[PDB]
């Protein structure tokens, strides 16, 4: 369960911000709305 500005990374088992992926290469499919 992550907010609308975060995706879940199974390696760290924690919600990672989308900003770190939006402004950097192709973000995950779930962050396309936050960019």
């Amino acid at each position, epitope marked *: 369960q992550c907010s609308a500005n975060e995706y879940f*990374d199974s390696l760290l088992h924690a919600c*990672i911000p989308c900003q770190l*992926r939006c402004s950097s290469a192709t973000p995950p499919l779930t962050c396309a709305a936050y960019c």
Partner: antibody
Amino acid sequence: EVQLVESGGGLVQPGGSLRLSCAASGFTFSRYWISWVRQAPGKGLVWVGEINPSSSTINYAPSLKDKFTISRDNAKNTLYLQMNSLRAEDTAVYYCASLYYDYGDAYDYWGQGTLVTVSS
Amino acid sequence: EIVMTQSPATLSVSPGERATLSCKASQSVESNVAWYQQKPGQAPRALIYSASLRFSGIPARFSGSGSGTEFTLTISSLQSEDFAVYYCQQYNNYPLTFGAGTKLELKR
């Protein structure tokens, strides 16, 4: 200083059992996932399994379903690995490790590894 | 399982120059690849966790990229302490699988 001291582990003929301990100290062990990873002499890394904080979701490796059993004791801030019926292919340096993402940064901590030798 | 094909097996290059590793995935793991460093005698040391996102305390010279089935860690300017083994890992599908592992040596 964070630490993940690993005790237990040595020599044992095939079919035998051997429990390993991975004691932590320096970070909240009870709020992160902690996994196991073995490395056969002169070879690559192998993901054994992982376990969540509340021990409500234990993920092993298919090829090692019956051999290994993972559990943790948050009261002692220590992870466990209960190995059962091993073979020569199960000889490796078993590392424990914990990855998480607090404080806005991603971290990772490892034990010094312990050698497990399976041979007659 | 998902086989991570990591080439070259060995790379020889001098400090200050560049180094680009490659890690091909048996099947599309999306952006869920990591990168570790291990020196003889010590335990692995992670560097990348989302194919580009870096861990804490990891210099900016380590630059990872790629998605789907092809990933590459780039060590822009090398240093003496950066010569070791490097693995790639996927965690999009269980179990987590590593790569064969490239090893950097110092060309002298």
